Amino acid sequence: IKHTEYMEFLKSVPTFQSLPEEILSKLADVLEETHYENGEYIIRQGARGDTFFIISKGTVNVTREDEDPVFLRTLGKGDWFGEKALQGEDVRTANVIAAEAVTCLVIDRDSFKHLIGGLDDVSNKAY
Numbered sequence: 001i002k003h004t005e006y007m008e009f010l011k012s013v014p015t016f017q018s019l020p021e022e023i024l025s026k027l028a029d030v031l032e033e034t035h036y037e038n039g040e041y042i043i044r045q046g047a048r049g050d051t052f053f054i055i056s057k058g059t060v061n062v063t064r065e066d067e068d069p070v071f072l073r074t075l076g077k078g079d080w081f082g083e084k085a086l087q088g089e090d091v092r093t094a095n096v097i098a099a100e101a102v103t104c105l106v107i108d109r110d111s112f113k114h115l116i117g118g119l120d121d122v123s124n125k126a127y
């Protein structure tokens with residue numbers, strides 16, 4: 001293997017191919033693979049979060065309640081989410097819901113803050 005599979009996947013993602021491979025190797029060491037089915041909430045707006053997600057398989061819907069939640073966007077393989085709760089306050093600012101069989105590569109806060117949080121795509125993200 002999985003470490004090699006994770007290496008090969010991360011090297012294919014434009015945000016992460018900017019990273020030194022030794023950093024990619026450390027990420028591949030520590031990331032956890034989680035799996036979702038259609039309709040399964042991955043993140044719930046208003047929860048407190050410490051994890052960053054990279055989609056390695058499937059698609060997800062992002063929604064946010066600003067009564068009912070409005071559809072924001074769909075993300076797929078190679079996209080990522082969960083950074084805002086890692087950028088200051090730890091509140092989740094939107095829901096992310098699986099729309100099918102999903103594999104996310106999940107990075108914890110300690111790994112994120114050292115290895116990912118400085119990436120300009122991530123730190124300068126805007127919606």
Ligand SMILES: O=c1c2ncn([C@@H]3O[C@@H]4COP(=O)(O)O[C@H]4[C@H]3O)c2[nH]c2nc(-c3ccccc3)cn12
Nearest residue numbers: 043062072081082083084085091092093094095127
């Ligand atoms: O358009 C988006 C969006 N598209 C994807 N995502 C991802 O959903 C994740 C949910 O967890 P998180 O830890 O908050 O990180 C998030 C992002 O990665 C989005 N978030 C997101 N927040 C806003 C917002 C916030 C505060 C005030 C007004 C609008 C708009 N907005």
